[PDB]
Design a binder for this molecule. Structure first.
Ligand SMILES: [Zn+2]
Ligand SMILES: [Zn+2]
Ligand SMILES: [Zn+2]
Lengths: 101, 1131, 117, 101
């Protein structure tokens, strides 16, 4: 399930550059690898290539809903800051439940 | 010849003044940076390996020399011009100088066809420059020269200017390296652990920590293990010794146990031998090490090679990283095991983690060196790739195009600009808080920020041990100045005469020890180590000696004569354990002390005489140090020193305490820092009060710097009428508090008058405030720039118009000029426009992007500056000026932790008055004194009455037996006043005498930055956040106040359910959703056409309206994002 | 009783481990690396002083008398040399509870006598 | 709780091939006073002896005697671990152990 635009608003900066949410960047990665896997299964690809693509898709979905997986690398973004997954959006203090409800 | 007691108080302070004439208050910053530029950069460039690249032809590209020119700036035309720091501040430039490196590329193909091409002064990067350093254009300039350049002569320097922002590097604490520290963790598998963070002399890699631990009791006995680097499994010490070529157990215990007459050590090492008997040769031990490692090679050959490389490079680099050093490494690891056994046998004390003799202060120089090593390595890497992609084609390449100078430049600039100390990519592994924005609120705040130390233990840590004021901070760190929030004890401040060593090479000391009767460690037999004294130099055991006493005498004589040993070299003789540890490395905090003869000072009266005419005969502090009269002693050498608090301690007494002193304090008041040295009579206050003042002297208004008229600071407060305190300490003469004071002497009466000063509040005189009492001016700078980033959209300063601009507020733009910039002298109210900026669109073809005033300010435009930024578009700074007259709610403080807000202001006829019609400027409540025990406040008030009536400045230096309360009272009784500072006051309203005689007199008060007008805020249906439709955060955002969890709990306890619902639903984020009565999931509603349907259930009749918070709708949608189905079932 | 020290082989210089010879019913010290054997002379193989009755006078060294930070006294003259001055200090050693006991050392050079009251 | 260490002064292992002529000189009286009558299987004796020395202070502080200690040892290890001891009259509270086979 890809959430609506309210959950991931594209805030406009001082100029016209529309900055997208962390969720939107992550969904972009997910759709990229999903389409890539879809073509690699549809057209010529090795079994290990499809396996690597499935592994990367798994990593993207997991880091979309939960970024602090022990051992795994954190889903990165521009400026070297990790993305804020759905879990950090409501994990504890300053999350939805404690910080907004 | 001898300085008598009656002259001592002059002599000592004369000596102290000479120190501050030589050094200053930011000497550590300047010396660190100077050593970094003079030495560290060259060492880093030379320590990099030559990059040998070949397909055939080959190229080495050896870097040999550096050149750092003065700071210059390159315009768009490219003309280099000398850039002044004030121009950098105004134009948002970076006060940096170019670094050029000489490169030597020799072509070697075949047939001895060799030819060298040297590129002299290849521009390798730009290095930001610390102000007032040797490589600063303000170096050596006179006060007239600095004023010609619009610089304050009192400005200490010691900071960088990055993008116009003054950044100060905070000294970072760290455990000293190359030293063995035996600790004991209560909750661990090991009973005792001896660690050694080892690092080679000229740093090239991180600190390689080696641990040598003992397994906790419960196979048969206690086993000694060694946690080597790059190996994820414990390794027995005997295995490590055999891997270094010592297979016989006798040899290993010769290296570990130096006294074979001691069976206790023997039986305690025996389990380790018994555990390692199957391994008995060097190759097998190396194979074992490689197998226990995290990269176990299937073939024992590469295992043994890997173990060799680890034991030669990563194990104890400070002992030596070359080959054939196995003897030194074996001796040192045996010393580690010996130290561990001494701790386990109780013959030595465990080492204290908090001892500052065990710590080092990472200053600007060694920190910039860490950055420069990383950045130069990255640069050489990029050069390697660039040159490789060319020589792979078999053709020459231009190194000037290989060197992308942005690595060093942008790296240093980013790191100093943000404070994230590390590579920009590793923005989370990097440690922030280094390189903070210099505090320019008052001169004391600037000095203290420039003398600030940091313990990076982590504020989250709740262990009080690192926060505690250790005994060893005496004379090195202010006992009082520390933040009282979440960083108690972690953020510290240098004491006034504290000097952090800059670093030195141990080569002359080692050479002299060689020429002297020391015996090297490879040449001795271990049997000699029993009675001999070990000699460590910068952590490396270099040899042994037979008479440590006269060795120490020789070395102390050498250091006191400024011979081969420099002054900052520490030389500790531990006597009970026969080590002599010599330290020359950087980061050692030390302080100067007066050396003592048999029972006499070496500071005779002739030195004071030559110091009195310091300005004629150029006899300075350095001549005092060179005379062998003063000595810098570090924290670790203080353990071996016997101090005299004053020369009075050197007098022969009816019962002698010591009679064998070695040093003397120059003055005990030098244990305080910059902000605690302003407290008068701090030894008559409770210490928390002194800490709170040391924090509150930094928010006090004054004149933060003399050249404030030219600075475009974001925030600046200047007091109209700063006054020097009537009651002062002798340390403020060097803090320059007299030239830039931060308060006013106020006639304060401690009384209960009308009840408006209760609970830490004050009653001020409205008439005094009308006369300019504690009036200030608040300067606020707004910056703006018009960006021509691309032809798609360009900004421009121009008076907007209602017919072309789209996002144009209803505020009037008439105050702007045709250039789009307001003019100075124009009175501007809240929400007004000061810069008219318009941006071209893709209300047509341009949108309004003007800069408004920060709301609810109401100042006057002080000045407008226009220039060009680094890239070169138009850049504007507008300073607006707002006069802040003190009022009810403004925070004021004395120098004794006595803070309070103005409760009310009475006119002069409403205030209480003495028989001679003196009304108090301030009235504070007597109830603020007793619990707080700020007797320094009362003594300062009395001393100030004496000073004002006598025409002098009171001496409130902390420990002064020539000034006590009885003397001050006797002095005050001579001027026709009650000796205790009381006076008969009359009620201002009725004129009747007050039955209780009030305590009144001059006290130095401070006006603090915290004015109520900058804090008052209100909201009623303002803007809301985008994500959750709740009120914004902050006054600046017109935000709402947080009704938090604790407020929810309080109102639940009250039982106020409708108020709770109003606060948490109706006053924050009311919202409506449409829910399917079947699946409980939010449906699709179309209220215009009135068509509601759930795509899930394919129904359009059973939909219900639900009034829920928007945050709850957002929560449920973020749960549906996680495949959770929160179904709001209305039945 | 007294402790027992480690003894090493005469060939491989490794430690000799205890062993018993049934033939003569006698203690031997033999190396488990080489094939050396030795006739023991103590007959005791292990000693544990749980009470830890250690004479700390053996741990003291005369050089400590050169410490300017130690207290000196004229009231306890030296029994070996007759010097008046002497430094004194406490045990300050772990595993010693009754550590308020004072140890004295003679400050005369080359005498270095140590004692306890 | 009182373990044997709390009341023990010092332990040691000797190589005593014949208990009749012990290694130590001061333990020859009570060892022969015990050995002149066969109380245990003298043939099932090992030459390795384990002599422990107690201290009168800790013995008295707990009202403890060698009888109770020896009973506890012979109970925890049965007859496999022989223990002998003198009376509570000698200047040194000593008791000697051997391993039975
Ligand atoms: Zn439905
Ligand atoms: Zn042997
Ligand atoms: Zn003596």
């Amino acid at each position: 399930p890809v959430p609506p635009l309210s959950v991931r608003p594209a805030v406009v900066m001082q100029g016209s550059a529309r900055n997208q949410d962390d969720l939107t960047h992550k969904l972009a990665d997910i759709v990229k690898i999903n389409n890539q896997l879809r073509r690699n299964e549809q057209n010529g690809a090795a079994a290990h290539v499809i396996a690597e693509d499935v592994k990367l898709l798994q990593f993207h979905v997991a880091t979309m809903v939960d970024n602090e997986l022990p051992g795994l690398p954190r889903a990165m973004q521009k400026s070297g800051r990790p993305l804020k997954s759905l879990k950090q959006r409501l994990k504890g203090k300053e999350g939805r439940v404690r910080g907004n409800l | 010849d001898e300085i008598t007691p009656d002259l001592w108080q002059e002599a000592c302070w004369i000596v102290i003044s000479s120190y501050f004439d030589e050094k200053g208050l930011v000497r550590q910053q300047l010396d660190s940076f100077d050593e970094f530029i003079q030495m560290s950069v060259q060492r880093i460039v030379e320590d990099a390996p030559p990059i040998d690249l070949q397909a055939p032809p080959r190229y080495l590209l050896k870097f040999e020399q550096i050149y750092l020119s003065k700071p210059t700036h390159w315009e768009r035309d490219g003309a280099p011009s000398p850039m002044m720091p004030n121009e950098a501040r105004l134009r948002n430039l970076t006060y940096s100088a170019p670094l050029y490196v000489d490169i030597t590329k020799t072509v070697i193909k075949e047939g001895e066809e060799q030819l060298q091409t040297q590129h002299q002064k290849t521009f390798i990067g730009k290095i930001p420059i610390m102000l007032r350093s040797t490589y600063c254009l303000l170096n050596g300039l006179t006060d007239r020269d600095l004023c010609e350049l619009n610089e304050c002569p009192l400005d200490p320097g010691g900071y960088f200017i990055i993008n116009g922002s003054e950044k100060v590097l905070i000294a970072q604490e760290k455990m000293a390296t190359n030293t063995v520290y035996v600790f004991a963790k209560k909750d661990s598998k090991y009973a005792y652990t001896g660690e050694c963070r080892s690092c080679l002399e000229n740093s090239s890699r991180p600190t390689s920590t080696i641990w040598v631990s003992m397994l906790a009791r419960g196979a048969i006995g206690q086993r000694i293990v060694a946690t080597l680097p790059y190996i994820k499994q414990e390794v027995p010490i005997i295995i490590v010794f055999r891997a270094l070529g010592f297979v016989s157990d006798r040899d290993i215990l010769e290296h570990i146990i130096y006294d074979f007459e001691d069976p206790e050590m023997m039986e305690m090492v025996k389990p380790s031998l018994d555990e390692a008997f199957v391994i008995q040769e060097q190759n097998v031990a190396l194979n074992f090490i490689g197998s226990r490692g995290a990269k176990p090679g299937v073939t024992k050959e590469k295992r043994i090679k890997y173990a060799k490389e680890v034991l030669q490079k990563e194990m104890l680099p400070h002992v030596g990283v070359s080959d054939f050093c196995e003897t030194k490494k074996a001796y040192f690891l045996g010393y580690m095991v010996h130290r561990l056994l001494l701790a386990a046998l109780g013959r030595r004390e465990l080492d204290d983690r908090d001892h500052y003799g065990n710590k080092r202060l990472d200053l600007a120089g060694p920190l910039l060196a860490f950055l420069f090593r990383g950045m130069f390595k990255n640069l050489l890497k990029e050069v390697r790739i660039y040159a490789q992609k060319f020589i792979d084609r078999g053709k020459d390449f231009n190194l000037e195009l290989a060197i992308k100078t942005r690595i060093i430049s942008d790296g240093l600039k980013y790191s100093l600009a943000t404070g994230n100390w590390g590579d920009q990519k590793k923005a989370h592994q990097a440690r922030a808080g280094v390189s903070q924005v210099l505090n320019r609120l008052t001169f004391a705040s600037t000095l203290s920020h420039l003398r600030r130390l940091n313990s990076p233990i982590g504020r989250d840590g709740k262990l009080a041990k690192p926060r505690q004021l250790h005994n060893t901070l005496w004379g090195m760190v202010c006992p009082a100045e520390t933040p009282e929030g979440h960083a108690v004890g972690l953020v510290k401040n240098l004491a006034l005469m504290a000097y952090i060593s800059v670093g030195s090479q141990p080569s002359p000391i080692l050479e002299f020890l060689e020429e002297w009767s020391m015996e090297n460690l490879e040449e001795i037999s271990p049997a000699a180590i029993a009675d001999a004294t070990k000699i460590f130099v910068n952590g490396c055991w270099v040899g042994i000696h037979k008479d440590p006493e006269q060795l120490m005498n020789t070395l102390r004589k050498l250091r006191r004569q400024m011979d081969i040993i420099v002054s900052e070299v520490s030389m500790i003789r531990d006597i009970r354990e026969r080590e002599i540890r010599i330290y020359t490395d950087a980061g050692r905090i030390c302080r100067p002390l007066l050396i003592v003869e048999k029972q006499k000072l070496l500071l005779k009266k002739r030195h004071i005489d030559q110091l009195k005419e310091r300005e004629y005969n150029n006899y300075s502090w350095q001549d005092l140090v060179a005379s062998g009269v003063v000595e810098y002693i570090d924290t670790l050498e203080e353990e071996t020193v016997m101090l005299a608090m004053t020369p009075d301690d050197l007098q022969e007494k009816e019962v002698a305490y010591c009679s064998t002193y070695t040093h003397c304090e120059i003055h005990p008041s030098m244990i305080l820092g910059v902000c605690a040295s302003i407290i008068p009579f701090p030894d008559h206050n409770q210490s928390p009060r002194n800490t709170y003042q040391s924090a509150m002297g930094k928010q006090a208004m004054g004149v933060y710097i003399t050249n404030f008229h030219v600075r475009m600071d974001t925030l600046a407060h200047v007091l109209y009428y700063p006054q020097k305190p009537l009651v002062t300490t002798r340390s403020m003469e060097y803090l320059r508090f007299r030239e830039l004071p931060a308060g006013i002497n106020s006639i304060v009466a401690i009384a209960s008058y009308t009840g408006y000063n209760q609970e830490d509040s004050v009653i001020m005189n409205r008439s005094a405030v009308d006369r300019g009492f504690f009036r200030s001016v608040f300067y606020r700078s707004y910056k703006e720039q018009e960006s021509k980033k691309g032809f798609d959209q360009e900004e421009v300063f121009e008076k907007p118009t209602r017919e072309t601009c789209q996002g144009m507020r209803h505020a009037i733009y008439d105050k702007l000029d045709d250039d789009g910039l307001i003019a100075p002298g124009v009175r501007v109210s809240g929400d007004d426009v000061i810069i008219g900026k318009t941006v071209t669109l893709p209300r047509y073809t341009k949108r309004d992007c003007s800069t408004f005033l920060r709301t609810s300010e109401t100042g006057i435009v002080d000045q407008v500056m226009v220039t060009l930024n680094q890239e070169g578009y138009k850049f504007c700074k507008i300073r607006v000026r707002s006069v802040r007259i003190p009022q009810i709610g403004d925070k004021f403080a004395s120098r004794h932790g006595q803070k309070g807000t103005c409760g009310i202001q009475y006119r002069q006829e409403d205030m209480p008055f003495t028989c001679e019609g003196i009304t108090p400027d301030i009235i504070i409540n007597p109830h603020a004194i007793p619990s707080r025990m700020t007797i320094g406040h009362l003594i300062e008030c009395l001393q100030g009455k004496v000073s004002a009536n006598k025409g002098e400045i009171g001496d409130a230096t902390p420990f002064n037996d020539a000034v006590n309360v009885q003397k001050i009272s006797n002095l005050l009784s001579d001027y026709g006043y009650h000796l205790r500072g009381n006076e008969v006051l009359y009620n201002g309203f009725t004129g009747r005498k007050i039955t209780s005689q009030i305590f009144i007199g001059p006290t130095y008060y401070q006006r603090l930055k915290h004015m109520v007008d900058d804090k008052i805020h209100s909201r009623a249906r303002g803007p809301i956040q985008i994500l959750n439709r709740q009120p914004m955060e902050g006054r600046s955002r017109d935000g709402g106040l947080r009704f938090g969890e604790m407020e929810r709990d309080c109102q639940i306890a009250h039982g106020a359910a409708q108020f709770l619902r109003e606060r948490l639903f109706e006053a924050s984020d009311p919202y409506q959703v449409h829910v399917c009565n079947l699946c409980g999931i939010m449906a699709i509603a179309n209220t215009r056409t009135h068509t509601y349907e759930c795509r899930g259930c394919r129904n359009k009749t059973q939909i219900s309206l639900v009034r829920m918070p928007y945050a709850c709708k957002l929560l449920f949608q973020e749960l549906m994002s996680m495949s959770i189905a929160p179904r709001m079932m209305s039945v | 009783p007294g402790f027992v020290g480690i003894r090493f082989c005469q060939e491989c210089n490794n430690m000799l481990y205890p062993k018993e010879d049934k033939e003569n019913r006698i203690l031997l010290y033999a190396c488990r690396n080489c094939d050396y054997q030795q006739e023991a002379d103590n007959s005791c193989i292990y000693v544990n002083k749980i009470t830890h009755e250690v004479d700390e006078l053996t741990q003291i060294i005369a050089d400590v008398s050169q410490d300017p930070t130690l207290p000196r006294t004229e009231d306890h003259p030296c029994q070996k040399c007759g010097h008046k001055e002497a430094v004194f200090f406490q045990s300050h050693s772990a595993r010693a509870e009754d550590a308020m006991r004072l140890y004295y050392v003679c400050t005369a050079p080359h005498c270095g006598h140590r004692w306890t009251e | 709780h009182t373990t044997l260490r709390k009341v023990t002064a010092n332990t040691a292992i000797y190589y005593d091939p014949n208990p009749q002529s012990t290694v130590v000189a001061e333990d020859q009286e009570w060892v022969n006073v015990y050995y002149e009558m066969p109380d245990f299987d003298v043939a099932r004796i090992s030459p390795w002896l384990l002599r422990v020395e107690l201290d009168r202070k800790h013995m008295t502080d707990r009202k403890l005697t060698m009888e109770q200690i020896a009973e506890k040892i012979n109970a925890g290890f049965g007859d496999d671990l022989n223990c002998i001891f003198n009376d509570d009259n000698a200047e040194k509270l000593v008791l000697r152990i051997r391993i039975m086979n």
